[PDB]
Amino acid sequence: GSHMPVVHVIDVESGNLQSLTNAIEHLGYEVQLVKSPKDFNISGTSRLILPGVGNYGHFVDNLFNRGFEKPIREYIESGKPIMGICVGLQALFAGSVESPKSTGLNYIDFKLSRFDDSEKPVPEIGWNSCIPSENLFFGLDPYKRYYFVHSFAAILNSEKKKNLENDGWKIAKAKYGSEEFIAAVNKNNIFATQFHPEKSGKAGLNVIENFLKQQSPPIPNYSAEEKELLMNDYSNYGLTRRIIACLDVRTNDQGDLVVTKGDLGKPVQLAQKYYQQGADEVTFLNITCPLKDTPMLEVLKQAAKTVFVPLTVGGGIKDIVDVDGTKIPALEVASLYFRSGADKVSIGTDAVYAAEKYYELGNRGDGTSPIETISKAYGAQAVVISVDPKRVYVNSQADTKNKVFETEYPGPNGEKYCWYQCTIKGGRESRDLGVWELTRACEALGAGEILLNCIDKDGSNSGYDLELIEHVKDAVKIPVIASSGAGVPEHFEEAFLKTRADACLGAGMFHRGEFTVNDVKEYLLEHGLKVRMD
Numbered sequence: 001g002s003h004m005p006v007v008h009v010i011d012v013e014s015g016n017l018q019s020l021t022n023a024i025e026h027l028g029y030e031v032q033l034v035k036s037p038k039d040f041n042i043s044g045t046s047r048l049i050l051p052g053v054g055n056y057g058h059f060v061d062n063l064f065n066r067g068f069e070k071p072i073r074e075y076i077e078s079g080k081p082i083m084g085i086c087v088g089l090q091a092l093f094a095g096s097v098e099s100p101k102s103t104g105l106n107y108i109d110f111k112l113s114r115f116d117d118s119e120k121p122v123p124e125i126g127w128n129s130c131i132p133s134e135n136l137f138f139g140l141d142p143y144k145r146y147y148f149v150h151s152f153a154a155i156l157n158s159e160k161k162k163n164l165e166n167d168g169w170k171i172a173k174a175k176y177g178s179e180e181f182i183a184a185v186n187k188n189n190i191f192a193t194q195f196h197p198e199k200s201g202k203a204g205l206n207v208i209e210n211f212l213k214q215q216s217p218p219i220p221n222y223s224a225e226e227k228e229l230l231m232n233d234y235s236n237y238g239l240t241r242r243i244i245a246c247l248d249v250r251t252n253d254q255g256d257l258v259v260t261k262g263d264l265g266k267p268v269q270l271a272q273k274y275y276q277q278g279a280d281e282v283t284f285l286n287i288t289c290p291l292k293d294t295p296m297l298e299v300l301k302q303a304a305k306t307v308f309v310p311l312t313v314g315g316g317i318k319d320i321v322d323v324d325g326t327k328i329p330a331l332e333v334a335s336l337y338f339r340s341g342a343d344k345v346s347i348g349t350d351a352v353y354a355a356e357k358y359y360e361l362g363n364r365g366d367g368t369s370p371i372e373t374i375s376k377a378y379g380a381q382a383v384v385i386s387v388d389p390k391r392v393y394v395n396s397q398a399d400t401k402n403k404v405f406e407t408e409y410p411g412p413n414g415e416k417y418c419w420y421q422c423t424i425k426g427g428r429e430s431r432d433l434g435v436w437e438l439t440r441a442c443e444a445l446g447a448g449e450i451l452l453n454c455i456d457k458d459g460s461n462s463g464y465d466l467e468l469i470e471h472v473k474d475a476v477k478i479p480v481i482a483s484s485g486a487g488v489p490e491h492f493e494e495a496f497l498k499t500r501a502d503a504c505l506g507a508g509m510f511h512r513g514e515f516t517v518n519d520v521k522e523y524l525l526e527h528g529l530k531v532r533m534d
């Protein structure tokens with residue numbers, strides 16, 4: 001209550017706030033949540049953090065409706081330190097095209113606009129960097145990486161940067177594709193980041209720490225060798241080659257949670273191991289009692305105490321009927337996982353039903369699918385589609401309704417074309433839907449990322465299905481993650497150099513300890529690729 005500095009965090013109670021609070025505590029601070037203006041007072045507050053995730057209007061409506069506008073402005077006028085994170089940063093602007101009708105605090109007189117997806121995937125999901133500058137602050141290091149996850153940004157041009165400079169604003173710039181945008185701002189007592197420091201490992205914690213202690217340490221004195229190695233060369237649009245570690249979560253006989261089919265601290269510990277070994281993100285495949293007491297939620301909550309990178313959970317995110325008969329829609333189930341520590345949810349089977357219905361309605365959605373409800377509330381960046389396809393040959397496009405493509409490898413009868421058929425219920429059942437049609441429908445519906453598995457390569461340890469990746473990349477404009485088949489570092493290299501995969505996921509190879517995320521990163525690094533090394 002006074003035995004340690006107190007940090008007040010404005011909580012609109014929507015989204016994952018576990019990471020931010022755990023980071024602050026981990027830094028030696030006590031967290032005081034502020035769900036209402038009644039929960040804090042100007043003079044009694046020395047450190048205020050405004051975290052925000054999701055649709056711009058959603059967050060700003062919520063915030064302003066609870067009466068935080070005046071309290072926030074007054075606090076800012078008090079001259080005391082305030083930190084905005086992600087939407088907290090956007091809230092400082094005039095508004096956002098994401099929610100046309102919305103209005104911000106307008107400290108910066110222009111709106112956030114959507115990234116250009118003609119040249120790159122949108123949303124931006126990954127590790128970008130601040131452009132070297134003389135006016136960086138709070139320790140922002142151009143040679144480190146921070147995690148960004150957003151479709152909208154304060155996109156810059158010469159005119160806006162000049163006005164900002166004349167307005168006395170210090171701007172940390174970043175570039176995604178050919179577009180420059182505000183990664184961070186600083187003017188007097190106001191500080192805000194577009195990236196999630198709490199989701200940016202040690203580099204992130206340093207930023208929060210530098211803020212809480214109000215200090216801008218100089219960046220390390222790297223050697224010219226190190227700089228050339230650590231600098232952003234803007235390959236892959238400026239994002240590092242994202243390495244994802246995945247683990248299964250099962251309930252054995254005794255009813256305990258384990259990762260292996262034969263054995264809840266195991267899943268937790270492994271996730272921690274992964275994080276410690278460089279994983280840029282950890283995915284839990286929930287394959288395991290009232291919703292409130294789901295064991296998976298505890299794994300996430302426990303993992304979130306020390307794992308400061310994005311967490312993804314797939315499985316069970318759908319409309320459900322609780323133990324008391326209460327009907328709980330997908331949206332509320334997701335919110336439960338998010339508030340528990342998850343940053344993204346993976347939709348599998350329902351994604352196929354959604355896509356199918358989507359075409360039935362003539363390429364439109366009814367806004368009732370988990371994809372639509374969750375993405376509209378939390379943004380596309382929060383919804384991941386897990387796809388489980390299987391190659392199917394045909395003599396020509398004339399043999400099927402689904403889009404096919406000329407393959408370099410002929411079929412049993414010499415068929416030179418093929419499409420990938422999707423499956424559901426753990427790949428136990430097939431559907432008359434191609435992956436081309438499935439991904440395009442889900443994207444239209446609001447999915448922000450595609451987890452591209454491959455039934456045929458799963459468990460093989462012989463590399464990814466490269467034509468599949470390219471096939472899906474031709475289909476959608478959202479990030480595509482290569483999964484299934486990864487066995488050795490070389491497979492990651494092949495995917496990043498021979499295909500347009502936006503990330504690579506590994507499971508068994510990391511689980512069996514054959515290699516670590518770092519082994520893979522060292523390899524890629526040694527081969528000219530850019531990887532997060534924190």
Ligand code: NI
Binds near residue numbers: 001002003004
């Ligand atoms: Ni105290």
